[PDB]
Design a protein around this ligand. Structure first.
Ligand SMILES: [Mg+2]
Ligand SMILES: [Mg+2]
Ligand SMILES: [Mg+2]
Ligand SMILES: [Mg+2]
Ligand SMILES: [Mg+2]
Ligand SMILES: [Mg+2]
Ligand SMILES: [Mg+2]
Ligand SMILES: [Mg+2]
Ligand SMILES: [Mg+2]
Ligand SMILES: [Mg+2]
Ligand SMILES: [Mg+2]
Ligand SMILES: [Mg+2]
Ligand SMILES: [Mg+2]
Ligand SMILES: [Mg+2]
Ligand SMILES: [Mg+2]
Ligand SMILES: [Mg+2]
Ligand SMILES: [Mg+2]
Ligand SMILES: [Mg+2]
Ligand SMILES: [Mg+2]
Ligand SMILES: [Mg+2]
Ligand SMILES: [Mg+2]
Ligand SMILES: [Mg+2]
Ligand SMILES: [Mg+2]
Ligand SMILES: [Mg+2]
Ligand SMILES: [Mg+2]
Ligand SMILES: [Mg+2]
Ligand SMILES: [Mg+2]
Ligand SMILES: [Mg+2]
Ligand SMILES: [Mg+2]
Lengths: 87, 128, 200, 90
RNA sequence: UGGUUGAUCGCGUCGGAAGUGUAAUCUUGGGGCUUAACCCUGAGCGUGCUUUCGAUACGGGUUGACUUGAGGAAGGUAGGG
RNA sequence: CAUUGGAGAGUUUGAUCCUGGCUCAGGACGAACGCUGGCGGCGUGCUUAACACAUGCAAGUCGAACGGAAAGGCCCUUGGGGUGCUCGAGUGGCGAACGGGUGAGUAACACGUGAGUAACCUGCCCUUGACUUUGGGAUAACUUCAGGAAACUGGGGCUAAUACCGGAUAGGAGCUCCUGCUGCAUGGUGGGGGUUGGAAAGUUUCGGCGGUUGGGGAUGGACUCGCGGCUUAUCAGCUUGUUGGUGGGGUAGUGGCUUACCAAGGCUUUGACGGGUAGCCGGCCUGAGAGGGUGACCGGCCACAUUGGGACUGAGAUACGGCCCAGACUCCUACGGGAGGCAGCAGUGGGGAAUAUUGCACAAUGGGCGGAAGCCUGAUGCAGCAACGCCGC
């Protein structure tokens, strides 16, 4: 870079990328845990995993790592899957 | 942010501003959401015309004036109607008034001293 | 940007007295030069061009500005030749000439460009200043005793002032009653021919 | 009860046309014809455009005069929906 | 592209209304630069489009009549088709 | 129940009339050249090499978020008080996505015009309702060590926040169930219930200035669509995620956007596909008009920033003066490895018939940050240069 503002910016961009990547990977792991519970067909495990995943999606949306609309979409998918499992 | 600012127009060394409403990102002399008034500072007691209803609407909707437009609104009294403050509100003095027909009728009749200072300049050529 | 050469040559070529009288125009029936006495064909262009050049050299206006006057008259409503002659008469130097404060239009241009005149309070040194109605042209107070001015003051009684101007000779004040009409401009050209010329 | 600014006003585009293809599921290709002046010679021409609508239940057939209303993009090419069948030519 | 005519629709067509057609330009009315070029300002233009309300003479759509265009039947009939 | 507007000429013959081409008189220009050249006013000035670029500048700001003290500045026997203003370097916030440039690509919902989003997002600003709770762990700077020619890199120790991370508490966020009124199909909206959940930050010279979250407003953007504007048939077939369906995924959002499965579609002689050329427009020139030509300045939209590709950060990204990879180039190197992108302003080389100063100022208007004084601004305002245009003398 040629501007010290831009050098500061590349440093902060890397830092924010680390933070956001960590949060997104955690979200993906939680959603995968719920999906595997749903495939296994358990009810209590799937319910607990769904609660955890929805809470973490909302937490990430609050942190700004993901958009609130994306959080809502993923939560809706998880809740609909859990409802189908219960039915 | 939406701003109420001045859009420059006119010639070199002769600026006339249009008090317009546009967002900050837009270029100075560009498309405006609305044209509110005009401001000719080059003229005597600068001309300041501001559409009171529209400027009140834009202030109430949250447009941010530039310092120049704040001065103009102070002079037009709009900056007191909105954000009530104790300011003189010096509504523009008029840039005086000339006339032509009255002067022509005055001189057509002036006659007398017209040709009178005229024969006085006859005496002047005598002096010349 | 101003014709400074002889005017009698142009008057002889154009066949009419551009200005003045009782002069070297006793050789009028033939244009200047070695080939002056020969018989002429005179096409329509020739005729039209002669009328246009007569107006131009009478009023001291070059071709670009005369053309501009032509488009202004053409755009204006009414007879194009009438409007064109009205504009040329509304020129300030011609106004001074017609009021009679100058011996000729060239002298009027000289004094106007030298600034010996005031237009309704404001000093003007533009010969092409188009005088508007109800205007008051005044001689500059410093220059109220010019030799040409005193000659005009001695001679104006013989000169005829048109109806659209009022002059306070000794006072040097030309009141413009109205902007002149075709019947008030003296007929010495064919404005219709000029208009036809500017259409080819 | 007290709903918000009702009416929505904002009306969508409506086209009357003729079905020219019904052989794909839940879709009918409608041919809509308009009459306009020729820009230069002034004759009233006939401009025809093919519009793909969404026909839930496959209720329309070849040669049927139908009415379609514009919608949001329902597929890569479908942007209209069948609202009624005016003449069932069959 | 369309003979005569009844009914109907109101797509073309025609007439209002609303919205839009930024500004500048352009036309034009005022004003400022000593005039002009140029500049400011009011209006027009923006030849369209959308929405909406009317008109139904014509074009067209739908629908029903009529026989004069067109075709057919029966009889007559000419010919190196 | 009138118009503002239309000019020809020469040339086929021995002569004539007609047909007919050619040529000319007019206007114009982002023009060049030749001869000539006084001034002023207002504009305009690389149309070719989106050719390669030396040098300076063109994006910073905030101490009223933070640790601090490398300078200046006050108070003290030279260091010492961070002590107050101030203040490099560092964290943190915001800006850097604007402004400015160019027209290479693009025959395309790119643009013009008019609509739709019941498929959308929107920082700062305005408005209104709730709030601003309880804890914790690091780290840059600094310090020490090691490595490197450099660019710089890696350890040890140490430290603060409006930096970062647990928790509590908050709807109009997920799911679900009643019920009112309703639209344009998917539906929209009012009311109630169940259930699972989502925040925050402090600071001040006490004058301030801020934080989080609902709902509206304004602003800006996004997508979809009807209609409109080139040439070529000596290009006739094009397409297989292609056309549609269902489930999932994805996204701010609809969607073959993506995926699996099913079906066999979709486009085209009213010109698909291919070739050629081209940014589009408000406008400009010409013309009686209809048209024809054109897309300089100025203004709107789009595209692009060494070539190709990619994401990251962010409210927002073709990210001009960002990052990553590759190619072509230029430069530094101690040969191990590094650095760079004027189609920003001025300028150089080059090409060309041809197009300017390595200027001044932030005084005005506009923009960024700051509570403010203020700082930054090659935007802009100006000046220099050239008869390049118009106008006046
Ligand atoms: Mg993992
Ligand atoms: Mg989904
Ligand atoms: Mg008929
Ligand atoms: Mg009828
Ligand atoms: Mg105007
Ligand atoms: Mg004037
Ligand atoms: Mg306009
Ligand atoms: Mg009919
Ligand atoms: Mg028979
Ligand atoms: Mg012959
Ligand atoms: Mg011959
Ligand atoms: Mg500092
Ligand atoms: Mg731009
Ligand atoms: Mg352009
Ligand atoms: Mg925080
Ligand atoms: Mg098209
Ligand atoms: Mg699907
Ligand atoms: Mg091109
Ligand atoms: Mg074009
Ligand atoms: Mg432009
Ligand atoms: Mg992001
Ligand atoms: Mg950048
Ligand atoms: Mg930019
Ligand atoms: Mg650059
Ligand atoms: Mg340059
Ligand atoms: Mg050369
Ligand atoms: Mg300022
Ligand atoms: Mg200030
Ligand atoms: Mg600077």
């Amino acid at each position: 870079p040629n501007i010290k503002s831009q050098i500061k910016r590349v440093k902060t961009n890397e830092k924010s990328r680390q933070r956001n990547k960590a949060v997104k990977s955690a979200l993906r792991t939680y959603v995968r845990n719920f999906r595997r519970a749903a495939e296994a067909g358990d009810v209590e495990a799937a319910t607990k995993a769904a609660r955890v995943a929805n809470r973490q999606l909302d937490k990430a949306a609050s942190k700004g790592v993901i958009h609130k609309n994306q959080a809502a979409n993923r939560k809706s998918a998880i809740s609909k899957k859990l409802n189908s499992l219960a039915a | 942010a939406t701003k109420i600012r001045l859009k420059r127009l006119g010639k070199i060394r002769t600026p006339h501003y249009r008090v317009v409403v546009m967002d900050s990102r837009a270029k100075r002399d560009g498309r405006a959401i609305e044209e509110i008034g005009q401001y000719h500072p080059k003229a005597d007691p600068s001309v300041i015309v501001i559409d009171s209803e529209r400027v009140q609407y834009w202030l109430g909707v949250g447009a941010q004036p530039t310092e120049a437009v704040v001065a103009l609104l102070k002079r037009t009294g709009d900056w007191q109607k909105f954000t009530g403050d104790t300011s003189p509100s010096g509504v523009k003095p008029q840039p005086e008034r000339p006339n032509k027909d009255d002067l022509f009728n005055a001189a057509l009749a002036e006659a007398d001293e017209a040709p009178r200072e005229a024969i006085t300049k006859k005496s002047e050529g005598a002096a010349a | 940007a101003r014709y400074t050469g002889p005017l009698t040559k142009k008057s002889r070529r154009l066949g009419t007295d551009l200005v003045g009288n009782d002069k070297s125009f006793e050789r009028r029936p033939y244009p200047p030069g070695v080939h002056g006495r020969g018989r002429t064909k005179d096409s329509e262009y020739s005729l039209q061009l002669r009328e246009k050049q007569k107006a131009r050299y009478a009023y001291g206006v070059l071709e670009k500005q005369f053309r501009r006057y032509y488009e202004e008259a053409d755009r204006a409503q009414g007879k194009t030749g009438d409007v064109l002659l009205q504009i040329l008469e509304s020129r300030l130097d011609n106004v001074v000439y017609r009021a009679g404060l100058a011996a000729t239009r060239r002298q009027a241009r000289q004094m106007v460009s030298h600034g010996h005149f005031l237009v309704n309070g404001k000093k003007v040194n533009i010969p092409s200043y188009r005088v508007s109605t109800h205007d008051i042209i005044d001689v500059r107070e410093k220059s109220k005793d010019l030799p040409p001015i005193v000659i005009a003051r001695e001679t104006f009684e013989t000169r005829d002032v048109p109806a659209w101007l009022e002059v306070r000779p000794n006072k040097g004040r030309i009141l413009v009653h109205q902007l002149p009409t075709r019947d008030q401009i003296v007929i010495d050209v064919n404005e219709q021919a000029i208009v036809e010329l500017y259409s080819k | 009860m007290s709903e918000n600014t009702a009416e929505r006003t904002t009306r969508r585009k409506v086209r009357e046309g003729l079905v020219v293809s019904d052989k794909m599921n839940k879709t009918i290709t409608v041919m809509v014809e308009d009459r306009v002046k020729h820009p230069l010679y002034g004759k009233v021409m006939t401009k025809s455009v093919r519009l793909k609508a969404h026909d839930e239940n496959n209720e329309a057939g070849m040669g049927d005069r139908v009415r379609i209303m514009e919608t949001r993009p329902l597929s890569a090419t479908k942007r209209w929906r069948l609202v009624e069948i005016i003449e069932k030519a069959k």
